[PDB]
Design a protein around this ligand. Structure first.
Ligand SMILES: Nc1ncnc2c1ncn2[C@@H]1O[C@H](COP(=O)(O)OP(=O)(O)OC[C@H]2O[C@H](O)[C@H](O)[C@@H]2O)[C@@H](O)[C@H]1O
Ligand SMILES: Nc1ncnc2c1ncn2[C@@H]1O[C@H](COP(=O)(O)OP(=O)(O)OC[C@H]2O[C@H](O)[C@H](O)[C@@H]2O)[C@@H](O)[C@H]1O
Ligand SMILES: Nc1ncnc2c1ncn2[C@@H]1O[C@H](COP(=O)(O)OP(=O)(O)OC[C@H]2O[C@H](O)[C@H](O)[C@@H]2O)[C@@H](O)[C@H]1O
Ligand SMILES: Nc1ncnc2c1ncn2[C@@H]1O[C@H](COP(=O)(O)OP(=O)(O)OC[C@H]2O[C@H](O)[C@H](O)[C@@H]2O)[C@@H](O)[C@H]1O
Lengths: 413, 412, 413, 410
């Protein structure tokens, strides 16, 4: 009912959750000073815009903005379209286009981890005898939960007949961006090299011009996924990721063991929060690693472990990486994000992706309702990567600036 | 080819399935504690037998035992009669007779439902905006898919001339031998107790070599003991109605019951390609009409029969044109798990899961049948499978049902 | 389009068909003197009614009065319902009720037969080297081809809810005659010991209130067949036939080999000329023989051969006659009506049923369109059993008066 | 028990059926003389080979050679593999491969029809007031009912490469080995092949020989979709040419009922319906051929379609279409026509037939062919026992199908 000051609302959640009893004063000083923000320069060109991306967010945000809390603790309004109508320059909240461009960053900390597991219902909470430290790289992947985030970059349909987003125009260079021309180019096929109709198994995913989605056995209204443009987006994300992991291992003097969590393959892969696109987009996530790991050494990333639990995903992995030559070892597992053996921790920098949200504080929801929230409950990440608790995330000396060349080489600061 | 511990195998299927994506641990605690097992005392007379019926099954069972997986993940053997030969008291698997007596239970749970549709290829899968709750009653009807389950109670032929003593009450003055059945019929095909199976004008016939074929001759044509089947259906449906009614009373709301055509699909095909649903459906329907005409179910407001087949549609209309009773009866072409927000507010949503007495609830993991569609659109694999919900094995979650001579059902 | 005198028209068809070239003058006088009319006196009480039955008929009549010719050569009118409206006492034509009472007679002759076969498309014309003589008994069975002949005696439906035929009320004594009540007595089941819903294999045969027939999966609207009434009808026809065949053997000094053709089981078993109920009535045909042959003596009937070509019929025969203990030998064959071999002709009186029409001249159609027309082409039956050619059929000394007691014993004149 | 001379056996079945009751000797002389055999010369190049395709068959064949009767009335032998081992040249029966090449013919006849409906139990048997005449074109589609007919031309699995060499043009430019084809798809469909989707599960076959649903891509079979398309283009262009020719000789344009040949019993592997996979290539063969050639004696083509997926695929594939022959779908039984249509048009219909049974096949009402066999005079017109004219070269039409898919006739 009444709005609370945001720091005080956040610390009220730390007390209620019990997380303010897990970590000692001196431990939080260590993990908090290790915070880094790797910002893609093309999208986050200076200290003001980075710090706007980190602060002009809600506190809890799920179901594609349909429910959650503002930083002052008041609930989202019941009026749909509230967040899609936010203009650039709003004083408190990122606009849609600023949520896309502000997604081109990675926040890392060498955080304390007291437990692993707990999120998927069948994955028990397993406490560590004593806390370990993992470098956690928070990466907010493409979201398809609503119609006005990355839906606007990678889908052609009867309501969104053209792609319009000049800031991401490089993603569509030489690629079709109009719905009708795309249907003719495909002909009587579902796929070509640059694009593919979406199948949910056998039926098509279609959208009425009215606006609502529906499965159909007809090609006519079947939405088309701009797969090569999505692949170009992933190459920007994974490029930044591997560069900032490699750099973290270098500064530590230990090669990384990286848990390549399936960013964006869960909640973010559900168009309208109900049509699972994961089997379509996941191969391009995997091919973005394969391309980068075959063209660069990453001498301080020793091995990349892909936690993969679904049989189709597993065989997509085995198929994409049958070829894989590169020096970094790549392999899949059914092990939890935050589970490491004591032997690997002595040998490698333990590192893991937090599949995050560019419009919520790090940790997002306070239950075990997602991977990020699980991590937010098993680690010090809400102290280390939330500006209310760690002002250093706002300090420019904790920002690394990233320039992604055309070969996808990354130069850091 | 290495065995996995059954709970761990199940959890692995759950984890990879992704069906639980919208389930909250707070809700699963609720749904799982709602689980009940209504066991016909005549066939399932103690905790041990009920719990054996719940657990000594396969994980997945395709095509009436033709293939699948055991709970340890290992495939079915490539050898015929393997399941037919299982004796009572086998350490892991129910025997054929135990599969018959073990379908005299009903497993229910007020499960979460996240989508409806999906099973028949033509039936679009449709996500709910917000997960709803439906009390889902799992009932494995008679199976004719192979010839060593319910085929042995309701059909006479030249391979099984007469061929079960715990079901002897199902044949009162009903003949027992194939040759005697042919004589009592004479030149006709039907009396008040049995009937040959018309596929149209030809009959269904069995070579003494096994294997079925159409025939205009009456000498190999099989004979269906329709009265024993009707009595069996009265035992299922009265247990069903009593379970639904008692469930309504406990939540203090009358039920909207989806009366799924249990046993009218995969379970109604003999030898791959001989559908007999047009002959058995009326006795399924008349079971309801008798019980609804002789009893008040004050906590069942209405029973909607989803019916997609013209013959079934006409058989329903003709059977219930008499119908007067208080609980309303009608038919639709609506998906079993599709309910309107208005009906959820007014009624306990209820639906039958047409299940399998030899597989874990949900059975197959695709969308290849009504049960597995339900197993993917709901939390039923968390609520009605002992690996995830040990409450189902707990005698405080069992209701013992005694079905009397007037078919009244006394509960616990 | 101009009327011809009936005897002249009949002779034009005899010449047109080649029938006038087949028999010698003196042979035809012998065959013509043998004509007999066995008339059930309960229905045909005097010479005048018997002669009206024989003469007040069409020339050819098929499809339940839809097609054919009058005896003056004109085509039937287009008025649907013309024959249904014919009153008792019309100058030239039997009324529907007189057509029922009129089929309680049998017209026989010891006729010449020049060939067997020719009718069913699979049954080849087989000439005899020399013409033989067969005693041919013309018997018009129940017809269901339209709604206003025997349909009025044995069927209950939504438009014909009660059977109102006082002349046939002994057939229905103590039996149900009202549709609604009958559905109630049948109840859940399809078959009484007195009635049965009609099934065309799996579906029901039903009739709308608006008059039309249709197959249905519902038992509401399903027409009900009064099987016990029809059985009592068959006992009248069959005891008149055996009595008259028996008497014919007696006057010949030889015992009959009777070809018991399946009268009423072809064209006449098709309700509306489209819905075959042959499989329902045939058992009552066979049971009439089995009853009568078991309870009465026929010392001039050596054996009875049932030509039966349909597999169900065959199995109905075998099942109905397994129990048969009576003195006269009964069996089935697939041999043509008129086909006898030399030794049978010498040992026995060859006898055969002509399944006739009570409202056409004997022979009926002139092609090979039916059992009757086949006989009509292979034999002298059109010279012998048609009054234009043989006025003796009109002479009361050629009429035999048959009385049928309660026991179904028959006294003749 | 004891063999019967085949002509005698067939007449026995006919006489007991009752189906000829409204047929007149005079009419049968006409229907029988209308018989024609349109043979693709590429597969049936002479009178001898055509007459062998017509006569060296079983009488009735149930469930893909599982049960039936030979033309002498004896049952099938209780020996699995009997029919797969029939050799080329056997004295009485076609080998599997001759069963494939023997499918490339169409037997037509302007037959009497006394009723429509009956086959699907749900479909009412409705007698015509008077018998009509319908030019019925018997065409046997690909059979996938067992593994040794057309399964060998179009599927790849773990239990075998395609082996059949007179159908090599169907594969000219397409791959021929299961393992290597698994690697092309990599991560399920390309321009020439596709895995079979039952939904999210694939259809798999393990080496033991059975079929089973699977989420794994390792025993999942694979469909030479482009090979099948080229096969359908041979069938449909023969079908359209012969229908067009029959119109031209009657002086009437055809109303063709384009029955969903091969999409029912013939689409079931092992109960594993693949109809949703193959039906679009059947439809696309009509669309291609009708857009690129003229059939001045085909007025319109009514596709009877009863399944929601088929209907949506039809609407989608023919949305584009603007050829001059009208195309539309219906839910009307094959043999059901209106008075006005019979008068205006040449009624015409595909009988989805069997290449290894006498036309009509089973004698119940358990399929479209056997429904047609009971509702028409097709058993008198298109079976050599009753109509020796079907064996006469003057009733055979030689079809030559060029590479543009135009068809020259005789
Ligand atoms: N314990 C686990 N260990 C490793 N991987 C896992 C685990 N559990 C699930 N996964 C895999 O990790 C995949 C991704 O899990 P998701 O949490 O849905 O991430 P998103 O990027 O799609 O959605 C981001 C939003 O959800 C949150 O609210 C954020 O704050 C955002 O609002 C899962 O599908 C599994 O494949
Ligand atoms: N979406 C639907 N909603 C309601 N009813 C439906 C629906 N789809 C079909 N039906 C009707 O519901 C009827 C029954 O559907 P079936 O799945 O064959 O149930 P069974 O009792 O015969 O076989 C149970 C076995 O199959 C499974 O593997 C189980 O695990 C068992 O192994 C259908 O015929 C339709 O009339
Ligand atoms: N060659 C044969 N030999 C013996 N029986 C035969 C033969 N051919 C057929 N049948 C059997 O004989 C059965 C009856 O033959 P039907 O000709 O239909 O007589 P109806 O009594 O029903 O119709 C009488 C009307 O047809 C005429 O126009 C009359 O004049 C009437 O108008 C057939 O079904 C066969 O089982
Ligand atoms: N009344 C109908 N009218 C039009 N189409 C229909 C109708 N009924 C079903 N269909 C549609 O048309 C398809 C029915 O075709 P099918 O009879 O299964 O023929 P096949 O080519 O698959 O197999 C032929 C074999 O079965 C026989 O024994 C033959 O002798 C062969 O042995 C259905 O799938 C419907 O879409």
């Amino acid at each position: 009912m009444k709005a609370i000051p945001p720091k005080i609302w956040f610390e009220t959640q730390l007390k209620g959750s019990g997380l303010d009893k897990k970590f000692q004063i001196d431990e939080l000083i260590e993990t908090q000073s290790s915070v880094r923000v790797f910002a893609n320069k093309k999208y986050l060109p200076d200290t003001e815009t980075i710090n706007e991306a980190l602060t002009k967010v809600t506190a809890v945000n799920v179901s594609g903005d349909k429910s959650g809390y503002f930083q002052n603790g008041l609930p989202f309004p019941n009026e749909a379209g509230y967040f899609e109508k936010i203009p650039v320059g709003h004083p408190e909240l990122l606009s849609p286009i600023e949520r896309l461009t502000g997604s081109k960053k990675i926040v890392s900390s060498h955080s304390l981890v007291t437990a692993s597991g707990g999120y998927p219902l069948t994955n028990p909470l397993l406490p560590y005898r004593k806390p370990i430290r993992v470098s956690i790289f928070s990466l907010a992947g493409p979201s398809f939960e609503n119609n006005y985030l990355h839906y606007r970059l990678f889908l052609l349909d009867s309501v969104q007949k053209i792609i319009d987003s000049p800031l991401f125009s490089h993603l569509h260079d030489g690629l079709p961006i109009q719905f009708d021309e795309a249907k003719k180019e495909l002909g009587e096929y579902d796929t070509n090299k640059l694009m593919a109709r979406i199948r949910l198994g056998f039926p098509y995913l279609a959208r009425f011009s009215s606006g609502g989605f529906y499965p159909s056995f007809s090609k006519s209204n079947a939405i088309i996924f701009l797969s090569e443009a999505y692949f170009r987006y992933q190459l920007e994300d994974v490029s930044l990721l591997l560069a900032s992991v490699n750099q973290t291992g270098k500064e530590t003097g230990k090669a990384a063991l990286l848990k390549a969590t399936a960013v964006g393959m869960g909640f973010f892969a559900k168009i309208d929060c109900g049509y699972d696109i994961q089997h379509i987009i996941f191969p391009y996530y995997l091919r973005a690693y394969k391309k980068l790991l075959s063209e660069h050494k990453f001498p301080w990333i020793a091995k990349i472990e892909f936690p993969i639990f679904n049989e189709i995903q597993q065989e997509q992995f085995d198929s994409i990486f049958e070829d894989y030559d590169g020096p970094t070892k790549v392999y899949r597992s059914t092990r939890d994000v935050l589970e490491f053996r004591e032997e690997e921790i002595e040998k490698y920098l333990p590192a893991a992706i937090n599949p995050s949200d560019a419009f919520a504080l790090t940790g997002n929801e306070w239950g075990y309702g997602s991977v990020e929230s699980m991590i937010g409950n098993n680690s010090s990440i809400r102290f280390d990567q939330v500006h209310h608790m760690n002002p250093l995330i706002l300090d420019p000396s904790h920002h690394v600036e990233a320039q992604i060349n055309k070969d996808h080489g990354v130069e850091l600061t």
